Every structure is written in C-alpha cells, then in structure tokens.
Design a protein around this ligand. Structure first.
Ligand SMILES: [Zn+2]
Ligand SMILES: [Zn+2]
Lengths: 49, 116, 96, 127, 140
C-alpha cells in the first residue's frame, strides 16, 4: 500500500492502478526481452533531473 | 501457430496440454480446476529460433505522422497510387543483419507497409 | 537496395561501416596530400614539420583540408538521440 | 425527486467472465462480509450456494475527475439523471474450487514438480 | 575453411531454424504435418518396437544456409543425436534434396524394455527439456 509504487497512489482504493502499472513494467521488460524496444540509456540527459 | 493460451472456461487459469491415456487424443485440461477440453491444433510449443519477415508487421501505421522520418516521392504506394511514403530501417534489437528500408504510406487511412 | 554482400566474417552493419570509413579515410588522405603539395618552400608550417620541431602532416592537413571523421570509442558518432545523432538530422542518416 | 437520497452505484464486470445472461435467477448482493468497517468490499452470490460468487472493489477516481450522471430512459413523461455515488468492478472469486492455503510450503518448482499434479494427488487426500 | 571448420563450437542452436513439439499418436499419418512420405521408412525398425514409442513428436527444422557453409550434414547431426543420447531417444531425417528442412526426434517409451506414481516428467515437459539441453549444450 505504501512502499510499493507510491506515485501511482497510496490510498486503499488503488490496487487496480498499481496492478496496471506493474503490468506495464513487466510489459516493458518483455519488450526488451523479445527485442522490439531498445534498452534505455543512462547517459541520455532526458532521463536525468 | 500455437494459441498462446486458451484460458479455462470455468476457473480462468491457463489450460495446459495433457494426454488422454484412454482414447489417445490431445487434450488441454486445466490444473487448478478439473475442466478438460479437446484440442483443435496439435502444436503445443513453437519456438522458431531465428526470425521471420515480421518487420513488415510490428510497424504501426501512425508512424507516418512523425516529422523526424524521411519522406520520399519515389517508390509510391501499391495499395493506392499515392506518392509520399515515409521510410525507416528495422529499429529492432535483431538488426536482421540488413539495412532493409521499410516504407509506409503517408496519405491518411491508407496504412500500407512494404519492403523493397 | 539489399545488394550489399557481407565481407567474409562480418555482419552487414560491419561491412557498411567498413566501406564508408574506408571511403572517408581515403578522402581525408588524398585531400591532405593535395593540401601538402599546395605548399611553398617559404611556408612555416612546412618548415616546422620537415624540420621536426612540432606538428605532423595531419595538422597541415587539418588546417587546409578536411578536419576528418570524428570517432568516439572507435566508432562514428552514435545514435544517442533516439535513432539520430542530433535533432537537426533526420532519422536513419548514415551519411557523412 | 432530488430530495430523494437513494444513492446509485455502478456494478461493472469484466468481459472475461460471462455476464448475468439472465441465468442469474435471484441473488445479487452482500456488502459487509469482508469485515476481516463502514466501507469494505462487496461479496456477491448466485441464487444460493450453488453458483459463481464474486467481489467488487471500489473505484479510485470517480467524482474528482468528472462526475458521471446517469441519464435514464424513464418510460414516463420525464427523464431523470442521477449522480453516481461510487463505482466498483466485480471479479469472479470465492474460488469456485479448493484452495491450497498451506501447501506444506513447497519448493518453488526447483524440484521436478510434475505438473497436472499436486492437485490430483490433492482432492484424493481428503477423500 | 573446411579443415578448420572443425572448430568454432557449432551448436544446434544456430543450425536449427524452427522447432515444434507435436502430438502424433499414429506416425503413419502425420495429420499435424505435411510430410507423410518420410513415414515410409517407419516400415522396418525405428530402432525397435513401433508399439512402444511415445506419441510426442519434436519437429526441428535446420536452416540450410547456416548448415551449408559448415557442411555439417544431417547424417552427422543424426550421428551426434544418436551418440550423445543413445537409444533412449531416436530420429529420422529427410534427404537434403527435400528443400524443406525437417528432422524429428521421438522419445522411446524408456519402459520399452519393461513396462502410476510421481513421474520422472510427463513426456510433454520432458520434450521441452531435450529442446533446451540439446539446443544449447549439444556439441555438434
Ligand atoms: Zn477453470
Ligand atoms: Zn497509400
């Protein structure tokens, strides 16, 4: 509720949001596995704040 | 051509391949429930290894809207005699060891895609 | 056109890079040789290089010639900008 | 009619499971059993014990984003629009089956773990 | 090229092009596939006992470009399939003139010598095991 993925929500009614987002992460992981999307870059300055 | 899954009609937990030792016909019985159904296709596992020509697929049509992609007036569309196709390379982790430039039409609602 | 054939023992990207780099490097070398034959005995660059004081032939080139390919980590400038090298170039631009 | 304070809801199902299909004869509610307290998941049933039970958890964003009035056909002369008090989607559960709540804490598939087993060996244990 | 083709660790992973695990109960008619004329060599001996081969087929297809430079012939691939595993498994291969790559592995019953408890593995799963072990670890 509070530690896993705080930004999608912390309330008691956000299980579906947390599920969709974790599914999106597993989706991106599977796309990196198959090879469709390229692996993201650490030096790319858009990925830095 | 395996149907990646065929979820159970009852418990929704991913039917699995099981053998009918009695009559010897392929089945797809679940595990968590007891449901069992017959199987139309007999392929339970299909890994190829290398790949097919699947970059004519997996290239969505909306890419014609990208202002960062080239536009060529040569090589016109086949589905419709419209000019102005956008073209790119594979853009895949598996480069196919090739520079195949895949095209895509830029007239709206055409969405035709072809390699040459 | 997919009419390029892989040189023995290398992928198609590797033979493409090899051919483009060979063309560019032969271009730089011939450009530099013409530059160095354009000089006069009174030139001071040539005096300092044929003497031995400082500078190489590559510098007499880079001052009046092409500067040359800029390699980073042994390769041409990567596609670090999502399939381009800078937002001014269009995607899939392997040109010089 | 606005003075009436009956609060309308949303009973939504996934296209995965089969809808009421009118084979639902008569049973469609229970809201409190999830004690373990005023707002807790519904737990629904189907014409008694025999049937496919299910549970509905509420919606996070229903009113703050944009209120969803319910405009109704209202076979009378007038029409009416009701503000939805809450939205909650239903998922088929109560297992319709036997669940392994202890499993003797098995090895996680490191052993052979012959599949289509541990559930036919079970349901034989316990008769 | 050829005398030093005997290096490079050619493994069936890069030689193969496709794979498929099928269910053929009676091999005489490969209703799952489109090569029934090859079964005409299922006429004398599939190393023995047609009555005791498991009905699970492992169809593996081998790219001929990848195979033609190393020249590693399906006769030799067959030799290695035999030797590395023995007679517990089996095989039968097309000619190279077919122009449609194919080779099929079958799991002899392993009770074929002598015929209800927790399994070694269901032959289904155990064909997905010889589809990795043989695909990555076999040294052709
Ligand atoms: Zn089920
Ligand atoms: Zn078109």
């Amino acid at each position: 509720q509070k530690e896993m993925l705080p930004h999608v929500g912390v309330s008691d009614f956000c299980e579906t949001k947390k599920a969709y987002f974790l599914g999106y992460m597993v989706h991106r992981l599977l796309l990196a596995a198959l090879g469709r999307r390229e692996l993201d870059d650490r030096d790319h300055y858009g990925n830095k704040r | 051509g395996f149907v990646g899954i065929r979820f159970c009609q009852e418990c929704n937990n991913m039917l699995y391949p099981k053998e009918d030792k009695e009559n010897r016909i392929l089945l797809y019985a679940c595990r968590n429930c007891d449901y069992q159904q017959e199987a139309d296709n007999s392929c339970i596992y299909v890994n190829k290894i290398t790949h097919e020509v699947d970059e004519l697929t997996q290239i969505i049509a909306d890419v014609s809207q990208d202002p960062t992609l080239p536009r060529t007036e040569d090589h016109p569309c086949q589905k419709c005699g419209h000019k102005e196709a956008v073209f790119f390379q594979s853009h895949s982790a598996r480069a196919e060891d090739a520079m195949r430039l895949y095209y895509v039409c830029t007239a709206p609602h055409c969405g035709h895609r072809w390699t040459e | 056109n997919n009419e390029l054939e892989p040189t023995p023992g290398n992928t198609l990207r590797q033979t493409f890079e090899n051919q483009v780099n060979r063309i560019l490097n032969d271009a730089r070398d011939k450009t530099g040789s013409s530059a160095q034959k354009s000089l006069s005995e009174y030139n001071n660059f040539k005096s300092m290089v044929v003497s031995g004081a400082k500078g190489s032939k590559i510098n007499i080139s880079q001052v009046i010639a092409v500067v040359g390919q800029q390699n980073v980590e042994g390769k041409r400038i990567p596609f670090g900008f999502k399939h381009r090298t800078l937002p001014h170039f269009i995607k899939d631009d392997y040109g010089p | 009619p606005k003075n009436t304070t009956k609060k309308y809801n949303i009973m939504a199902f996934n296209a995965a499971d089969k809808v009421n299909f009118a084979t639902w004869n008569q049973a469609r509610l229970e809201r409190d059993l999830s004690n373990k307290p005023e707002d807790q998941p519904w737990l629904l049933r189907v014409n008694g014990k025999s049937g496919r039970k299910f549970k509905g958890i509420k919606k996070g964003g229903v009113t703050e984003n944009t209120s969803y009035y319910i405009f109704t056909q209202c076979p009378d002369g007038a029409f009416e629009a009701f503000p939805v008090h809450n939205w909650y989607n239903f998922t088929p559960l109560a297992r319709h089956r036997t669940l392994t709540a202890e499993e003797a804490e098995e090895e996680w598939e490191r052993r052979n773990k012959v599949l289509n087993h541990f559930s036919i060996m079970q349901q034989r244990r316990l008769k | 090229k050829d005398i030093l083709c005997r290096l490079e660790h050619t493994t069936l992973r890069k030689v193969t092009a496709n794979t498929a695990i099928y269910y053929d109960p009676n091999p005489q008619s490969t209703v799952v596939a489109e090569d029934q004329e090859w079964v005409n060599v299922y006429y004398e001996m599939p190393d023995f006992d047609v009555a005791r081969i498991s009905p699970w087929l492992l169809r593996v297809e081998l790219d001929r470009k990848h195979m033609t430079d190393r020249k590693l012939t399906m006769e030799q691939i067959a030799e290695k399939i035999n030797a590395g595993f023995g007679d517990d498994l089996n095989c039968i291969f097309n000619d190279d003139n077919a122009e449609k790559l194919v080779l099929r592995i079958r799991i002899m019953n392993s009770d074929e010598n002598k015929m209800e408890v927790v399994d070694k593995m269901d032959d289904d799963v155990f064909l997905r095991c010889i589809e990795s072990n043989m695909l990555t670890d076999m040294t052709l």
